[PDB]
């Protein structure tokens, strides 16, 4: 594998040196798009620039898409530091799109479990959007420690009943130390006109969050690149699993 | 940000100086409509006017309605004690409305947690009004120690099983101690004027306490000023929330 | 406010000395009453009677409720005993009527709870009727010993695990010595004459007790006075309170 | 009240002596047919035969009817054994019938409760039949040490988690050494013939063992006699009751 | 009653003594059915033989069936043994047939729990047929130590938390060296020809193991011979017992 | 029985040995089509090629098929990296076919219970494919070590709430060093065909693992190979059981 500290070199690297056809590093003007008026939270990045740039690099997001997204990420905030004199700005999320092959709702198995999957369907259901903590703070209401715990949108909140300093067992969730974004959940599913002669179309549900919520509605069919998450079912009880695609990024396709 | 004990002082000054075209002081007269025979219990503030007086304050009640409002309302009582030798009156409101920017429910998201928003819609439903503890009194059974406990309407019942005196488990909550207020549940959703080409309405469940309890039912739109208050959805195990709108001013509109 | 002690003597000394326009005192005729073949459970009085001949007393009935008919309720038992030469006579109730402000279930809010209100309305629904622990005596299945613990209609039982005087867990309610009355549920809700032009009708349960328990049934409109009584929602988690109405006097109305 | 030793004493004296119009004993009779080759498992006592004889006995079954039945039952186990020569015979039940006053299901409430009623009525429902541990016998799996514990038809099981000898928490119940008989609930309200002008028919479940079960079906108008019995509803937290009539006696009435 | 220990001998010597009209050893021959191609798992046999042969016996299984049955099917393997030199064949089962008196379905009552009793009846369900445990063995999960318990198909499954052994909480159920055999439920009532006039067929569940399973199907006739036996309704709280019939013999009739 | 040591050498003797009628041996070639550039995942053994090869170990395949098949594919291990030189080769699945004798569903059975059966008849449902952990890995929040678990897909998920080596209580599952397979529920009931009259299908329910899921739909009949799996009803706690084929091979059959 590619360790932590060097993949964010690599990826800082390519975002200020890879250059197109006529030489204009596309990257540089990408994190240039979240200075502006309306500025935009992410940086979509074309696995295919990528890979012709830093071929290694680009496997390793494919195969370990947690540690390689927090890392371009890390490299984005970085070259706004040292290039753009910026380090008050957000998070800015690396979304992934173009990847090498494209596979539907009815491929997806165990064999894509933590592993960045590229999925066209057709979306069938959408939520309603809710606030998410992706970091809660939990404050000791008898010592006024703080401690900071990050969430994840597919797992269950992860609390603590116990003072990491004071060992007291009165601690509440403060919700303005605590960090929100949007939250909505999607259903997709393979297009009936990739099917039948008396086949069933397979589903899978999704989630979106931050800057990437409400972008599609029932009808609209869709490219979506994601991990592939897994958790127990409802009873917690048997080795059987259901699969949710947190997505990375998402478009439309003119049908 | 500005201190609690100062942004007092500030309302205080807002409340008896400010002056519109003519020079009458409003305040003055709406502070004076509590004195009435049916009079009022709260003073609805135009933000307008405050930003125009002090508008490091009047964004400081939209980034801090909580602090804010609860400063108006001491500054409300101190006006009466000081200028209208009055102090045996009850809790007065402190009602604003008129915001600078007036968002849509569909706009309503988790950038808005614990900030003062303008909402307009249309009310789809209204709880029937039931009684709410707006302070407890929890009285021991045994040594017959007074404990006070300010309640909120979004959140659950904070009970205290143990006295904080002899440290006794046998206490009751003391109705005639404890004070009430009604309440009122209703939900608003946008307006169908407002939307559509195949879109659908998105909602959100608010609440009204003591005087502004009943002022609308289905069918009127509304403009709502108020508090988007998040709290955890029933499991309480997921960290995901529900959103509820703590109303601090409501009117209706003339369609 | 009002002594217990005193509020006793005010209600014996109104009883025995109030009298109509004739000069014939009315509640010594209505004490009278309880003496005969199939006698009364209780004494209606009549507010203005008592308003006329001690106001500030008639004031503390309304304000204090419990108070109020308990101390008129003793004072009953003196006079019975007093100048009836009466001393068995089992508990006779104390009833209001003819309150000064009459109003309606629409208008019946937090700011009622444990003060007598008098109401109008129409009787949508009559409970059966069930028998309730007025005084429940529990008995130490050990030792032997015994325990008083009245009951309220509206409130849970009142249990007690532990034996106050040898401290064993086991207890059982013991039905013989323990103290019973009949019981029954009703609803009452605004009269649809007095209301809509498109408006909705509100309503609040009640109950009865003892000797008033089946005086009316589904469609009788009446006049009822009694007790504005507060109870936490099914959960007993949210601070919002279920409204229900103690009845201490009812009388139909010839429509 | 009268003494249980010395209840028994002139019941049995009631059995022996008591003579209707031309002298013959009509109890000795009853008894008799106790011993023949279909016997029967009770012994009918006409109430006005017993009020004629003893009426303070007589009234202390209606106050009593609990140590009152148990007192005539073992006085029919006496004159067994010391007139007929008769130790072996079972339980032989005591079933009084043609009490003074016969009152209807609909006057049927609080002040019943524990003492022996007549009521007419018309049968609406009847259970199937099934079996009821009179008494329960538990031995411990332990030390194998057997305890006796009487059950109550409309009252749950009383279980014994503990061993009164050693101490164990390893106790089951033995099918083989306790007393089942046969159990019928049947539901019985106020004939439609006694009622209405727009009333609405009461009514009240009513259970029946041993060999008085099955007599009724649904259809038959009954005259039944009982013990009044209340048991908390369901939730067991409200302090209303749930009334049952324990029957004593049963008989048809030809419509 | 008749001893364990003799009670086999008794029926040791009624299996190979008794004789027919002509002197053929009947249960001879039927031992010698078990050893065939396709051989026979149980023994009917006809109580009438039995009883001529040996009525103490005869009505010893009618009392206790339990015992009666255990002591039948041990004395079948000792003249297995003893008089085939057959050791190895598993369990077979003695099946009663042919009883004195033979009830109906409404005729069953708590004066037959734990007692064989013949019933005409007509089957109105018949269950799915599943395994049960009829010898569950429970090995530890730490020391490795077997635990031998039989069940019941009626009762409910007794498990062990605890080693006998070791006293380690790591237990489980070892299917392999566990026993079990076929299930299967059905439903009788009371034939509609031997009733009515407007009366309602009663029923009884039952219960089939092993060899008897399957042998019938909804609309069959049958008198089946088996033991009533008790079991407390659902909640387990309440004094009544449900009663299923644990089928000893089953035979169809032509109707 | 044979021993487990031992029974690898015999199949792996068998796989390498076995020819067919003109001498190439068929599982050489089998498990030559493991190596090629869409490879499968098992080897399909022919039980007819086996029993003639070694009827000894033919048997004891179908008496013990747990052990019997786990030998089999460490002999597929073995023959690989001995004769093939490959190691890294992942589980590769023993799947026997063509039993001596097919049986149909309504013959399942008790007598089946932990041993290889071959059923024919017709898929009625299938259920969505979903992961399964094939072996769970946990690791200890606290001092972490790791510890392996492997699953059963009929049985519940065994967790491990005590740490192996620090017996700390804060342990996860480790979903990256974890095990998951698809997993495909489905049922089949017997062939209408094959049966009637009147009479009624048998289903059962069985489940399918990693390659061999999806292979088949609703309507398609198939004969399938399996192990009848026991495990007990819903509650837990009667000692009656539910049936599951653990499917070991499946072939559709052209209708
Ligand atoms: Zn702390
Ligand atoms: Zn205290
Ligand atoms: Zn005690
Ligand atoms: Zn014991
Ligand atoms: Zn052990
Ligand atoms: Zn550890």
């Not at 008026?37 to 997001?61: C, Q």
């Not at 949108?153 to 601690?171: A, R, T």
């Not at 509605?217 to 009873?235: F, H, M």
């Amino acid at each position: 594998s590619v360790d932590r500290e060097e993949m964010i070199e690599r990826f800082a690297n390519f975002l200020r040196e890879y250059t197109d056809e006529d030489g204009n590093p596309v990257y540089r003007g990408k994190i240039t798009d979240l200075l502006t008026i309306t500025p935009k939270r992410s940086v979509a990045i074309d696995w295919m620039h990528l890979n012709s740039f830093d071929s290694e690099l680009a496997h390793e997001v494919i195969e370990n898409p947690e540690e390689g997204i927090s890392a371009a990420e890390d490299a984005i905030q970085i070259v706004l530091r040292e290039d753009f004199q910026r380090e008050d700005v957000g998070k800015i999320h690396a979304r992934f799109y173009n990847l090498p092959e494209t596979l539907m709702v009815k491929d997806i198995g165990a064999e894509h479990i933590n592993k960045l999957i590229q999925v066209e369907g057709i979306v069938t259901r959408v939520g309603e959007i809710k606030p998410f903590v992706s970091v809660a703070v939990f404050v000791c209401k008898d010592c006024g420690h703080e401690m900071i715990v990050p969430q994840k949108p597919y797992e269950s909140l992860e609390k603590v009943k116990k003072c990491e300093q004071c060992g007291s067992k009165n601690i509440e969730l403060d919700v303005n130390k605590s960090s929100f974004v949007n939250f909505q959940s999607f259903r997709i599913q393979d297009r009936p006109e990739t099917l039948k002669g008396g086949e069933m179309p397979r589903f899978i549900d999704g989630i979106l969050l931050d800057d990437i919520v409400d972008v599609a509605l029932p009808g609209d069919r869709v490219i979506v690149t994601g991990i592939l998450r897994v958790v127990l079912e409802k009873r917690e009880k048997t080795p059987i699993f259901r699969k949710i695609l947190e997505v990375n990024h998402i478009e439309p396709v003119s049908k």
